[PDB]
Coordinates of C-alpha atoms and ligand atoms in Angstrom, one line a residue:
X1 CA -1.0 4.7 -8.5
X2 CA -4.8 5.0 -8.5
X3 CA -6.9 6.7 -5.9
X4 CA -9.4 5.1 -3.6
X5 CA -12.9 6.5 -3.2
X6 CA -15.3 5.2 -0.5
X7 CA -19.1 5.7 -0.4
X8 CA -21.7 4.2 1.9
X9 CA -23.9 2.4 -0.7
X10 CA -23.7 0.6 -4.1
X11 CA -26.2 2.8 -5.8
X12 CA -24.1 5.8 -4.8
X13 CA -21.0 4.1 -6.1
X14 CA -22.4 3.5 -9.5
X15 CA -23.6 7.0 -10.0
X16 CA -20.4 8.6 -8.8
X17 CA -18.5 6.1 -10.9
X18 CA -19.9 7.9 -14.0
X19 CA -18.0 11.1 -13.1
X20 CA -14.7 9.8 -11.8
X21 CA -11.8 9.1 -14.1
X22 CA -9.5 6.1 -14.6
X23 CA -7.2 7.1 -11.7
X24 CA -10.1 6.6 -9.3
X25 CA -11.4 3.4 -7.7
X26 CA -14.8 3.6 -6.2
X27 CA -16.0 1.3 -3.4
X28 CA -19.0 1.2 -1.2
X29 CA -18.5 0.3 2.5
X30 CA -22.0 -1.1 2.3
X31 CA -23.1 -0.1 5.7
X32 CA -21.7 1.4 8.9
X33 CA -18.7 -0.9 9.4
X34 CA -18.3 0.0 13.1
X35 CA -20.7 1.4 15.7
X36 CA -22.0 1.0 19.3
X37 CA -23.5 -2.3 20.7
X38 CA -26.9 -3.8 19.9
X39 CA -21.8 6.1 40.6
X40 CA -21.1 3.7 37.8
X41 CA -22.2 0.1 37.0
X42 CA -20.0 -1.9 34.7
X43 CA -23.1 -3.7 33.6
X44 CA -24.8 -0.6 32.2
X45 CA -21.6 0.6 30.5
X46 CA -21.1 -2.5 28.3
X47 CA -24.7 -2.4 27.1
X48 CA -24.3 1.2 26.1
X49 CA -20.7 1.2 24.8
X50 CA -20.2 4.6 26.4
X51 CA -18.9 5.5 29.9
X52 CA -20.4 8.7 31.5
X53 CA -18.2 8.0 34.4
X54 CA -14.8 7.7 32.7
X55 CA -15.1 10.7 30.6
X56 CA -17.3 9.2 27.8
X57 CA -14.9 6.5 26.6
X58 CA -16.5 4.5 23.9
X59 CA -16.3 0.9 22.8
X60 CA -17.1 0.6 19.0
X61 CA -17.3 -2.7 17.3
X62 CA -17.3 -3.8 13.7
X63 CA -20.7 -4.9 12.6
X64 CA -21.7 -8.6 11.8
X65 CA -20.2 -10.0 8.7
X66 CA -18.5 -6.6 8.0
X67 CA -15.2 -8.1 9.0
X68 CA -14.3 -9.3 5.6
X69 CA -15.4 -6.0 4.2
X70 CA -12.8 -4.3 6.4
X71 CA -9.9 -6.4 5.2
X72 CA -11.0 -5.8 1.6
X73 CA -10.7 -2.0 2.1
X74 CA -7.3 -2.2 3.8
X75 CA -6.0 -4.0 0.7
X76 CA -7.3 -1.4 -1.6
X77 CA -5.8 1.2 0.7
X78 CA -2.3 -0.2 0.5
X79 CA -2.4 -0.1 -3.3
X80 CA -3.6 3.5 -3.6
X81 CA -1.8 6.8 -3.2
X82 CA -4.7 8.8 -1.7
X83 CA -8.0 7.9 0.0
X84 CA -11.1 10.0 -0.6
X85 CA -14.0 9.9 1.9
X86 CA -17.2 10.7 -0.1
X87 CA -19.9 10.0 2.5
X88 CA -23.0 12.3 2.6
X89 CA -22.4 15.8 3.7
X90 CA -24.4 15.8 7.0
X91 CA -22.9 15.0 10.5
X92 CA -23.5 11.2 10.5
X93 CA -21.9 11.3 7.2
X94 CA -18.8 13.0 8.8
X95 CA -18.9 10.3 11.5
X96 CA -19.2 7.5 9.0
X97 CA -16.2 9.0 7.2
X98 CA -14.4 9.1 10.6
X99 CA -15.1 5.4 11.3
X100 CA -13.7 4.5 7.9
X101 CA -10.5 6.4 8.5
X102 CA -10.1 4.8 12.0
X103 CA -10.6 1.3 10.8
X104 CA -8.3 1.6 7.8
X105 CA -5.5 3.2 9.7
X106 CA -2.6 5.0 8.1
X107 CA -1.4 8.6 7.9
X108 CA -4.0 11.4 8.2
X109 CA -2.3 12.9 5.1
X110 CA -3.5 9.9 3.2
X111 CA -7.1 11.0 3.7
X112 CA -9.4 13.6 2.1
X113 CA -13.1 14.3 2.8
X114 CA -15.0 15.4 -0.3
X115 CA -18.3 17.2 0.0
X116 CA -21.1 17.6 -2.6
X117 CA -24.8 18.1 -2.5
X118 CA -25.7 16.4 -5.7
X119 CA -23.9 13.7 -7.8
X120 CA -23.3 15.3 -11.2
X121 CA -20.3 15.7 -13.6
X122 CA -19.8 19.3 -12.6
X123 CA -20.4 18.8 -8.9
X124 CA -18.2 15.8 -8.6
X125 CA -15.4 17.7 -10.4
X126 CA -15.4 20.7 -8.0
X127 CA -15.6 18.2 -5.1
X128 CA -12.4 16.3 -5.9
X129 CA -10.8 19.5 -7.3
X130 CA -10.6 21.3 -4.0
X131 CA -10.9 18.5 -1.4
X132 CA -11.0 19.3 2.3
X133 CA -10.2 17.6 5.6
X134 CA -12.3 15.5 8.0
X135 CA -14.0 18.0 10.4
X136 CA -13.5 16.5 13.8
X137 CA -16.0 19.0 15.3
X138 CA -18.9 17.7 13.2
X139 CA -17.8 14.2 14.2
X140 CA -17.8 15.3 17.9
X141 CA -21.3 16.8 17.4
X142 CA -22.7 13.6 15.9
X143 CA -21.2 11.4 18.7
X144 CA -22.4 13.7 21.5
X145 CA -26.0 13.3 20.0
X146 CA -25.6 9.5 19.9
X147 CA -24.2 9.4 23.4
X148 CA -26.9 11.4 25.2
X149 CA -29.6 9.5 23.2
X150 CA -28.1 6.3 24.4
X151 CA -27.9 7.5 28.0
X152 CA -31.6 8.5 28.1
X153 CA -32.7 5.3 26.5
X154 CA -30.7 2.7 28.6
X155 CA -31.0 4.6 31.9
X156 CA -34.6 5.9 31.9
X157 CA -36.1 2.6 30.5
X158 CA -35.1 0.4 33.4
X159 CA -36.8 2.8 35.7
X160 CA -40.0 2.7 33.6
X161 CA -40.1 -1.1 33.8
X162 CA -39.8 -1.1 37.5
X163 CA -42.4 1.7 37.9
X164 CA -44.8 1.1 35.0
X165 CA -44.2 -2.0 32.9
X166 CA -41.6 -4.3 31.3
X167 CA -40.6 -3.5 27.8
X168 CA -41.3 0.2 27.8
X169 CA -38.9 2.7 26.2
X170 CA -37.8 6.3 26.6
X171 CA -36.3 8.7 24.1
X172 CA -34.5 12.0 24.6
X173 CA -36.5 13.6 21.8
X174 CA -38.9 10.8 21.3
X175 CA -40.6 11.5 24.6
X176 CA -40.9 15.2 23.7
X177 CA -42.5 14.3 20.4
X178 CA -44.9 12.0 22.2
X179 CA -45.8 14.9 24.5
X180 CA -47.0 17.1 21.7
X181 CA -49.3 14.4 20.5
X182 CA -50.5 13.7 24.1
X183 CA -51.4 17.4 24.5
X184 CA -53.2 17.5 21.2
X185 CA -55.1 14.4 22.2
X186 CA -56.2 16.0 25.4
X187 CA -57.2 19.2 23.7
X188 CA -59.5 17.3 21.3
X189 CA -61.0 15.2 24.1
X190 CA -61.9 18.3 26.1
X191 CA -63.2 20.4 23.2
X192 CA -66.8 21.5 23.4
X193 CA -68.3 22.5 20.0
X194 CA -70.0 25.9 19.8
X195 CA -73.1 26.9 17.8
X196 CA -73.1 30.0 15.6
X197 CA -75.1 31.0 12.5
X198 CA -74.7 32.6 9.1
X199 CA -77.2 34.1 6.7
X200 CA -76.9 34.3 2.9
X201 CA -79.0 36.3 0.4
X202 CA -79.9 35.6 -3.2
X203 CA -80.5 38.9 -5.1
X204 CA -81.0 40.3 -8.6
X205 CA -79.1 43.1 -10.3
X206 CA -81.1 45.7 -12.2
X207 CA -80.2 43.9 -15.5
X208 CA -81.5 40.8 -13.8
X209 CA -78.3 38.9 -13.1
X210 CA -77.9 36.7 -10.0
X211 CA -75.9 38.1 -7.0
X212 CA -75.1 36.1 -3.9
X213 CA -74.3 37.9 -0.7
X214 CA -73.5 37.0 2.9
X215 CA -74.6 39.0 5.9
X216 CA -71.6 40.6 7.6
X217 CA -73.0 43.3 9.9
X218 CA -76.1 44.4 11.8
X219 CA -76.1 47.8 13.5
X220 CA -72.5 48.2 12.2
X221 CA -71.6 45.3 14.6
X222 CA -70.4 41.9 13.3
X223 CA -73.2 39.5 12.5
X224 CA -72.9 36.3 14.5
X225 CA -76.2 34.9 16.0
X226 CA -75.8 31.8 18.2
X227 CA -79.3 30.2 18.2
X228 CA -82.3 29.6 15.9
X229 CA -84.4 32.5 17.2
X230 CA -81.8 35.2 16.9
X231 CA -81.5 34.2 13.2
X232 CA -85.1 34.1 12.3
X233 CA -85.4 37.5 14.0
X234 CA -82.8 38.9 11.8
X235 CA -84.1 36.9 8.9
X236 CA -87.6 38.5 8.9
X237 CA -86.1 42.0 9.2
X238 CA -83.9 41.3 6.2
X239 CA -86.9 40.0 4.4
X240 CA -88.4 43.5 4.3
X241 CA -85.3 45.6 3.8
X242 CA -84.6 47.5 0.6
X243 CA -81.2 46.3 -0.8
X244 CA -78.6 48.6 -2.5
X245 CA -75.0 48.6 -3.5
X246 CA -73.5 50.8 -0.8
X247 CA -69.9 50.5 -2.2
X248 CA -67.7 48.9 -4.8
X249 CA -63.9 48.3 -4.9
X250 CA -61.8 46.7 -7.6
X251 CA -58.2 46.0 -6.7
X252 CA -55.6 44.0 -8.5
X253 CA -54.0 41.2 -6.5
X254 CA -51.2 38.7 -6.9
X255 CA -50.0 35.3 -5.6
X256 CA -46.4 34.4 -5.3
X257 CA -45.0 30.9 -5.8
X258 CA -43.6 29.1 -2.8
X259 CA -39.9 28.8 -2.0
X260 CA -38.0 25.7 -3.1
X261 CA -38.4 22.6 -0.9
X262 CA -36.4 21.6 2.2
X263 CA -36.7 18.4 4.2
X264 CA -39.7 19.6 6.3
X265 CA -41.6 21.4 3.6
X266 CA -41.0 18.5 1.2
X267 CA -42.6 15.9 3.6
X268 CA -45.6 18.1 4.3
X269 CA -46.1 18.6 0.5
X270 CA -45.7 14.9 -0.2
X271 CA -48.2 14.1 2.5
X272 CA -50.7 16.8 1.6
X273 CA -50.4 16.5 -2.2
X274 CA -49.7 12.8 -2.8
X275 CA -50.5 11.1 0.5
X276 CA -47.0 10.0 1.2
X277 CA -45.8 9.3 4.7
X278 CA -42.5 10.7 6.1
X279 CA -40.8 7.3 5.7
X280 CA -42.0 6.8 2.2
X281 CA -41.0 10.3 1.1
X282 CA -37.5 10.1 2.6
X283 CA -36.7 6.7 1.1
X284 CA -37.7 7.8 -2.4
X285 CA -35.9 11.1 -1.9
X286 CA -32.7 9.4 -1.0
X287 CA -33.1 6.9 -3.8
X288 CA -33.5 9.8 -6.4
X289 CA -30.5 11.6 -4.8
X290 CA -28.1 8.7 -4.9
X291 CA -29.3 8.1 -8.5
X292 CA -28.1 11.6 -9.3
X293 CA -31.5 13.1 -10.0
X294 CA -31.8 15.6 -7.2
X295 CA -29.8 17.4 -4.5
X296 CA -29.2 16.1 -1.0
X297 CA -32.5 15.5 0.7
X298 CA -31.5 16.6 4.2
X299 CA -31.4 20.4 4.4
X300 CA -33.1 23.5 5.9
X301 CA -31.6 25.9 3.4
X302 CA -33.8 27.4 0.7
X303 CA -30.8 28.7 -1.3
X304 CA -30.1 28.0 -4.9
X305 CA -26.7 28.1 -6.7
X306 CA -26.0 30.5 -9.6
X307 CA -25.8 27.7 -12.2
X308 CA -29.0 26.1 -10.9
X309 CA -30.9 29.4 -11.2
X310 CA -29.4 30.2 -14.6
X311 CA -30.3 26.8 -16.0
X312 CA -33.8 27.1 -14.7
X313 CA -34.3 30.7 -16.0
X314 CA -33.3 29.5 -19.4
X315 CA -35.8 26.7 -19.2
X316 CA -38.6 29.1 -18.3
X317 CA -37.6 31.4 -21.1
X318 CA -37.5 28.7 -23.8
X319 CA -40.6 26.8 -22.6
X320 CA -42.7 29.6 -21.3
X321 CA -41.8 33.1 -22.4
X322 CA -40.8 36.6 -21.5
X323 CA -43.8 37.4 -19.2
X324 CA -43.0 34.4 -17.0
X325 CA -39.3 35.3 -16.5
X326 CA -38.8 37.8 -13.6
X327 CA -36.4 40.7 -14.2
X328 CA -34.0 39.4 -11.6
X329 CA -33.8 35.9 -10.0
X330 CA -35.9 35.2 -6.9
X331 CA -33.8 35.0 -3.8
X332 CA -35.2 33.0 -0.8
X333 CA -33.6 33.0 2.7
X334 CA -26.2 24.0 1.5
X335 CA -28.9 24.0 -1.2
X336 CA -32.6 23.4 -1.4
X337 CA -34.0 20.1 -2.7
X338 CA -34.2 20.6 -6.4
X339 CA -33.6 18.7 -9.6
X340 CA -30.0 18.2 -10.7
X341 CA -30.9 18.9 -14.4
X342 CA -34.1 20.9 -15.1
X343 CA -34.2 19.3 -18.5
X344 CA -34.8 15.8 -17.2
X345 CA -38.5 15.2 -16.8
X346 CA -40.1 12.8 -14.3
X347 CA -41.1 10.6 -17.3
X348 CA -37.4 10.2 -18.3
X349 CA -36.3 8.6 -15.0
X350 CA -34.8 5.1 -15.3
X351 CA -34.3 3.1 -12.1
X352 CA -37.4 4.7 -10.5
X353 CA -40.9 3.5 -9.5
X354 CA -44.1 5.5 -10.2
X355 CA -44.2 7.2 -6.8
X356 CA -40.5 8.1 -6.9
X357 CA -41.3 9.8 -10.2
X358 CA -44.3 11.6 -8.7
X359 CA -42.1 13.0 -6.0
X360 CA -39.5 14.1 -8.5
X361 CA -42.3 15.8 -10.5
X362 CA -43.4 17.6 -7.3
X363 CA -39.8 18.7 -6.6
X364 CA -39.4 19.8 -10.2
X365 CA -42.6 21.8 -10.3
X366 CA -41.9 23.6 -7.1
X367 CA -38.3 24.5 -8.3
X368 CA -39.4 25.8 -11.7
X369 CA -42.4 27.6 -10.2
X370 CA -40.3 29.4 -7.6
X371 CA -38.4 31.2 -10.3
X372 CA -41.4 32.3 -12.4
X373 CA -43.3 35.6 -12.1
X374 CA -46.4 35.8 -9.9
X375 CA -50.0 35.4 -11.0
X376 CA -52.2 38.5 -11.4
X377 CA -55.8 38.8 -10.4
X378 CA -58.6 41.4 -10.5
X379 CA -60.4 41.3 -7.2
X380 CA -63.9 42.7 -6.6
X381 CA -65.6 43.5 -3.3
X382 CA -69.2 44.6 -3.4
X383 CA -70.7 45.9 -0.2
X384 CA -74.5 45.9 0.0
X385 CA -76.7 47.9 2.4
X386 CA -80.1 46.7 3.6
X387 CA -81.8 48.5 6.5
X388 CA -79.5 48.2 9.4
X389 CA -77.7 45.3 7.7
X390 CA -74.5 45.3 5.7
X391 CA -73.9 42.4 3.3
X392 CA -70.8 41.4 1.3
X393 CA -69.8 39.6 -2.0
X394 CA -66.3 38.5 -3.1
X395 CA -65.1 37.8 -6.6
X396 CA -61.8 37.2 -8.4
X397 CA -60.7 37.0 -12.0
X398 CA -57.4 35.6 -13.3
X399 CA -55.6 38.0 -15.5
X400 CA -52.1 36.3 -15.8
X401 CA -51.4 32.8 -14.6
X402 CA -47.7 33.3 -14.0
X403 CA -46.1 30.6 -11.9
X404 CA -49.4 28.6 -11.8
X405 CA -48.7 27.7 -15.4
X406 CA -46.5 24.8 -14.3
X407 CA -49.2 23.3 -12.1
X408 CA -52.0 21.2 -13.4
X409 CA -54.8 23.0 -15.2
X410 CA -57.8 24.0 -13.0
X411 CA -67.4 36.0 -11.1
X412 CA -69.5 38.7 -9.6
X413 CA -72.2 40.4 -11.9
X414 CA -71.9 44.0 -13.2
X415 CA -73.2 46.6 -10.8
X416 CA -72.4 50.2 -10.0
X417 CA -72.6 52.0 -6.7
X418 CA -76.2 53.0 -5.8
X419 CA -77.8 50.2 -7.7
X420 CA -80.9 48.5 -6.3
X421 CA -81.0 44.7 -5.8
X422 CA -84.1 42.6 -5.6
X423 CA -84.4 40.0 -2.8
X424 CA -85.2 36.5 -4.0
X425 CA -84.4 34.2 -1.1
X426 CA -82.9 34.2 2.4
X427 CA -81.0 31.1 3.5
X428 CA -79.9 30.6 7.1
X429 CA -77.3 27.9 8.0
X430 CA -76.2 26.5 11.3
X431 CA -72.5 25.7 12.0
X432 CA -70.3 24.7 14.9
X433 CA -66.7 25.3 15.8
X434 CA -64.3 22.4 15.2
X435 CA -61.8 21.0 17.6
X436 CA -58.0 21.2 16.9
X437 CA -56.9 19.1 13.9
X438 CA -54.9 15.9 14.6
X439 CA -51.2 15.8 13.7
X440 CA -50.1 13.9 10.6
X441 CA -46.6 12.5 10.4
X442 CA -45.6 15.6 8.3
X443 CA -47.6 18.1 10.4
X444 CA -45.9 16.7 13.5
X445 CA -42.5 17.3 11.9
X446 CA -43.8 20.8 11.0
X447 CA -44.6 21.4 14.6
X448 CA -41.2 20.1 15.7
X449 CA -39.4 22.5 13.3
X450 CA -41.5 25.4 14.4
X451 CA -40.3 24.7 17.9
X452 CA -36.7 24.0 16.8
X453 CA -36.8 20.4 18.0
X454 CA -35.6 18.1 15.2
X455 CA -33.0 18.5 12.5
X456 CA -33.4 17.6 8.8
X457 CA -31.6 14.4 9.6
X458 CA -33.6 13.2 12.5
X459 CA -37.2 14.0 11.6
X460 CA -37.9 10.7 9.8
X461 CA -36.3 8.7 12.6
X462 CA -38.1 10.7 15.3
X463 CA -41.4 10.0 13.6
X464 CA -40.8 6.3 13.1
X465 CA -39.1 5.8 16.4
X466 CA -42.1 6.9 18.4
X467 CA -44.3 4.2 16.8
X468 CA -44.8 0.5 17.6
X469 CA -43.8 1.5 21.2
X470 CA -47.3 1.5 22.5
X471 CA -47.4 5.3 23.0
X472 CA -48.9 6.8 19.8
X473 CA -50.4 5.2 16.7
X474 CA -51.1 6.3 13.1
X475 CA -54.7 5.7 12.1
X476 CA -56.0 6.9 8.8
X477 CA -52.7 8.8 8.3
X478 CA -53.3 10.6 11.6
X479 CA -51.8 10.4 15.1
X480 CA -53.6 9.1 18.1
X481 CA -52.4 9.0 21.7
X482 CA -52.7 5.7 23.5
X483 CA -53.4 5.6 27.3
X484 CA -50.0 4.2 28.0
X485 CA -48.7 7.2 26.0
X486 CA -50.4 9.5 28.5
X487 CA -49.3 7.4 31.5
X488 CA -45.6 7.6 30.6
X489 CA -45.9 11.3 29.6
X490 CA -47.2 12.5 33.0
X491 CA -44.6 10.4 34.8
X492 CA -41.8 11.9 32.7
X493 CA -43.3 15.3 33.1
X494 CA -43.4 15.1 36.9
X495 CA -40.0 13.4 37.4
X496 CA -38.0 14.6 34.3
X497 CA -39.2 18.2 33.9
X498 CA -36.1 19.5 32.2
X499 CA -35.9 16.7 29.8
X500 CA -39.5 17.0 28.7
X501 CA -39.4 20.8 28.4
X502 CA -39.6 22.1 24.8
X503 CA -37.2 25.1 25.2
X504 CA -34.6 22.9 26.9
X505 CA -34.8 20.4 24.1
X506 CA -34.5 23.0 21.4
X507 CA -31.6 24.5 23.3
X508 CA -29.8 21.1 23.2
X509 CA -29.9 21.3 19.4
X510 CA -28.3 24.8 19.5
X511 CA -26.0 23.2 22.0
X512 CA -25.0 20.5 19.4
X513 CA -24.6 23.1 16.6
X514 CA -22.1 24.9 18.9
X515 CA -20.0 21.8 19.2
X516 CA -20.0 21.4 15.4
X517 CA -18.9 25.0 14.9
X518 CA -16.1 24.8 17.5
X519 CA -18.1 27.1 19.9
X520 CA -18.3 24.3 22.5
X521 CA -16.3 21.2 23.4
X522 CA -18.3 17.9 23.2
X523 CA -17.3 16.2 26.4
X524 CA -18.0 19.3 28.5
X525 CA -21.4 19.5 26.8
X526 CA -22.0 15.9 27.6
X527 CA -20.9 16.4 31.3
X528 CA -23.4 19.2 31.8
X529 CA -26.1 17.1 30.2
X530 CA -25.3 14.1 32.4
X531 CA -25.2 16.2 35.5
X532 CA -28.8 17.6 34.9
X533 CA -29.9 14.1 33.9
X534 CA -28.7 12.1 36.9
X535 CA -30.1 14.6 39.3
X536 CA -33.5 14.1 37.7
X537 CA -33.0 10.3 37.6
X538 CA -31.9 10.0 41.2
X539 CA -35.0 11.7 42.6
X540 CA -37.2 9.7 40.2
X541 CA -36.0 6.4 41.8
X542 CA -37.0 7.4 45.3
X543 CA -40.3 6.2 46.7
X544 CA -43.1 8.5 45.6
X545 CA -43.6 9.5 49.3
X546 CA -40.2 11.2 49.0
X547 CA -40.9 12.7 45.6
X548 CA -40.0 9.8 43.4
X549 CA -41.9 8.6 40.3
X550 CA -45.5 7.4 40.8
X551 CA -46.2 3.8 40.2
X552 CA -48.9 2.8 37.8
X553 CA -51.0 1.4 40.6
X554 CA -54.6 1.8 42.0
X555 CA -55.0 0.8 45.7
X556 CA -58.1 -0.9 47.1
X557 CA -60.9 0.5 49.2
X558 CA -58.9 -0.3 52.3
Ligands
LIG1 C1 -26.2 13.2 10.1 C2 -27.0 14.2 10.8 C3 -26.8 15.5 10.6 N1 -27.5 16.4 11.3 C4 -27.2 17.8 11.0 C5 -27.6 19.1 11.7 C6 -26.8 20.2 10.9 O1 -27.7 21.2 10.5 C7 -26.3 19.5 9.6 C8 -24.9 20.0 9.1 O2 -24.5 21.2 9.9 P1 -23.1 21.8 10.1 O3 -22.6 22.2 8.7 O4 -23.2 23.0 11.0 O5 -22.2 20.8 10.7 O6 -26.1 18.1 10.0 C9 -28.4 16.1 12.3 O7 -29.0 16.9 13.0 N2 -28.6 14.7 12.5 C10 -27.9 13.7 11.8 O8 -28.1 12.5 12.1

């Protein structure tokens, strides 16, 4: 009679229940149901639940207490015509859907795998309207990832305990992420500030208005003294010069709004704008999503659907006006993270705490803004001559706010070419170059994406998973490398070159995408991975005098 619909959480079940008819019975598996534990050695194989020596055979086990949950599903399955798997659209979502279908058993024809990137009336309709099949390639991709991660962790770690210290850990990508922080740490420790000066000038227009200028050239060459004397020398020359407006240029400029958020950009914005960490932002994001307020929070696509863009353009038109609505929609190049209904304001959210509302507001503003016209400004650039010196002044005036209208609310004098300015005061100032900035959780993710290391679905885990391991720590919202973090990084770099290499790591991601798109077979990809890995691991175990990993020692004076 009725149909069975399975989701992974209660909150997701309630929201989706609002859009599924009487013939549907929604049920949340409430968790993962089944998963993995916690030249071959049976001991290692059981702890991992994967066998690199018997063609990657796995040993999945239902989770604790989840046994009664299993039987409850089987019952609902026998009294339902069709079974719908409505797990989240990403790969682990596909895998979770796979585990459900394995555990419940039955004919494959009995199953369907729905896909949706937001939980709305219209989205849930098209989802169950044209349902698809479980994509085994996306499943194979997800498991391959879990398998190699497991292999690196359970096989490299034992070596680290023997060579460095008990309790240490290793991570396929985790170690690579730690390397970036370790290199940044070392950069900062070795940086040597450099002295360089600047000179500003206070002048008067003929009328008598105040005009501030900064020295840019001397002898037509850039002006950049490096000590106190070089400056005073230039200062006393400038004190006698006759100042005049050698040139004026007025050009209209514009500023365009940013593209709609994606996982990485969202985290950075949340961290920069609201001081939210990656974990905080991703938990609220998911909470808003499962509540039906925003689209799926794991994406690297900045695209927007036709309806989404048409609903927003209408909003801009009713609430802002003709001059804010571009002629044609803005096209940036799955969907971006955006509100599900542009007409629902942050203040109208129900089950959400203050910060989850602030995040929604941020997402809302970005979305609305990206579809509005750009801001217009009238820039002015005055160039002033004085002896062999050339000075400059910058000024900007807003003419049309455009997109900045949806963001919170927030001047050179009049002079013609050839006018004489009167010197009033000369102000020298000493500065010094700064060392590279420290990574933030979000910035680190940003760096990872730039290098193609993470994936919208692993960033948060990567970030969290490299902490409380004694390698890197967050202090004042910034990353700091610990000594043990450098100790382990050099070891891995010397004895696991390929695994620590940035290009090889990014390549693995491409590698994994290829399995998902049927451009590669998962076991073959795992075999090649294991081959390179065990060759590295074998040499690492040898005594250092044969090229093996160095011990964390320090011999006497003997
Ligand atoms: C669930 C999950 C998905 N993903 C991804 C990467 C892909 O961009 C995305 C879906 O891609 P696909 O449509 O090509 O299969 O799922 C991860 O990287 N890690 C995860 O844990």
